[PDB]
Design a protein around this ligand. Structure first.
Ligand SMILES: [Zn+2]
Length: 140
């Protein structure tokens, strides 16, 4: 589990979204496994605006933050998981590392802020849903 709290937005994995998230929906995209809902309180996370390929992610299933290199956000074929069939997922970045279903929502961060959240796992790889192209999270 986990979210990003920027401005009056909450960013979560679409497959973990709550009733309250859908009842306060701003934007969602199945293909990216992302959903954004509106918040009453201001959040304090900063979204990275960069093309970094190194950062640190939180892995709840190891209680550890791991430094990783990660790929450019792309359309990647993902194996079936407990929450999606095998499919193409867009705006996904891979690293070599551990990720199980409960790790979804863990933050990937670089020197510029939050890059994205854990979304995929298995096969010795971790996949992150990028948020750096969602420039509207910085305003409004
Ligand atoms: Zn960066």
């Amino acid at each position: 589990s986990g979210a990003i709290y920027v401005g009056n937005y909450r960013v979560v994995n679409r497959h973990l979204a709550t009733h309250n998230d859908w009842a306060n929906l701003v934007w969602e995209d199945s293909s990216r496994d992302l959903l954004v809902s509106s918040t009453t309180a201001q959040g304090c996370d900063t979204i990275a605006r960069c093309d970094c390929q190194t950062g640190v992610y939180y892995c709840s299933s190891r209680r550890k933050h791991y430094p990783v290199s990660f790929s450019k956000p792309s359309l990647i074929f993902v194996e079936a998981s407990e929450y999606y069939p095998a499919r193409y997922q867009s705006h996904l970045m891979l690293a070599v590392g551990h990720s199980e279903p409960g790790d979804c929502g863990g933050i990937l961060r670089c020197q510029h802020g939050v890059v994205g959240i854990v979304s995929t796992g298995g096969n010795g790889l971790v996949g992150f849903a990028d948020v750096r192209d969602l420039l509207w999270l910085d305003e409004e």
